[PDB]
Amino acid sequence: ASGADALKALNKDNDDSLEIAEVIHAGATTFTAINPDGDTTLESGETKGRLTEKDWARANKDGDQTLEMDEWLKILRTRFKRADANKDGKLTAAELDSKAGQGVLVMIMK
Amino acid sequence: ASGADALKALNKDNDDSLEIAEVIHAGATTFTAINPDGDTTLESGETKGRLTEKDWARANKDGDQTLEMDEWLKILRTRFKRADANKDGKLTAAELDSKAGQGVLVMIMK
Ligand SMILES: [Dy+3]
Ligand SMILES: [Dy+3]
Ligand SMILES: [Dy+3]
Ligand SMILES: [Dy+3]
Ligand SMILES: [Dy+3]
Ligand SMILES: [Dy+3]
Ligand SMILES: [Dy+3]
């Protein structure tokens, strides 16, 4: 998916950008959408192609093999900062289409 | 409620315990249940009696006046650890009934 696609689906206010509240909420929706096994936890197989082993090492600090909702969203907030090249707390289409923005996109859209 | 009543509410027996995945999932449901204004954000008036000013200062690091889901759940994970007096990763009824356990209960049930 592209940045224009994400704005079309996830932006409901009268702007051209995704703010952190919009991004976190879409991350929470996506967590459930990519979790087909009927639990409340993401296992490593469920996160392939969206998260790296380094993301798990950084965010999963509780000794389990499960990403709970908060550990997933922690990674997303870090990725938001990396994509927000002009520091204004808003992700525009150009920021979403950048390499760092692609990392946000894979956590906010199935 | 009490620890026993909280365990019963989550379809568990009186001598059972809560682990972090069930607690985080219940915290995520509670976030939305205590948020009656149609947004995706908890304002301070929505968290009175559940969170302190110091909780907001620790968890709300983004310069806004709003708790997103990840900031709320960060506080819950901190409270789980404080209520887990023996640090075994499980909260018994007695741990839930403690003063620190009360702080978990106000975040996992309306
Ligand atoms: Dy917006
Ligand atoms: Dy799963
Ligand atoms: Dy975990
Ligand atoms: Dy920006
Ligand atoms: Dy609200
Ligand atoms: Dy915030
Ligand atoms: Dy314990």
Author numbering:
A (entry chain A), B (entry chain B): 24 to 133
Text from the published report:
Second, adjacent EF hands in LanMs are separated by 12–13 residues—rather than the typical ≈25 residues in CaII-responsive EF-hand proteins—resulting in an unusual three-helix bundle architecture with the metal-binding sites on the periphery.
To understand the basis for LRE versus HRE discrimination, we also determined a 1.4-Å-resolution structure of DyIII–Hans-LanM. The structure of DyIII–Hans-LanM confirms the importance of second-sphere control of ligand positioning. In EF3, this carboxylate shift lengthens the distance between Arg100 and the proximal Oε of Glu91 from 2.9 Å (in LaIII–Hans-LanM) to 3.2 Å. The rearrangement of this second-sphere hydrogen-bonding network suggests a structural basis for RE-dependent differences in Kdimer values. By contrast, even though DyIII induces the same overall response as LaIII in stoichiometric titrations, in the chelator-buffered DyIII titrations Hans-LanM exhibits a lesser conformational response (1.8-fold increase). The main response to DyIII occurs at 2.6 nM, >30-fold higher than with the LREs, and with little or no cooperativity (n = 1.3). The apoprotein and DyIII-bound protein weakly dimerize, with Kdimer values of 117 µM and 60 µM, respectively, consistent with the ratios of monomer and dimer reflected in the SEC and MALS traces.
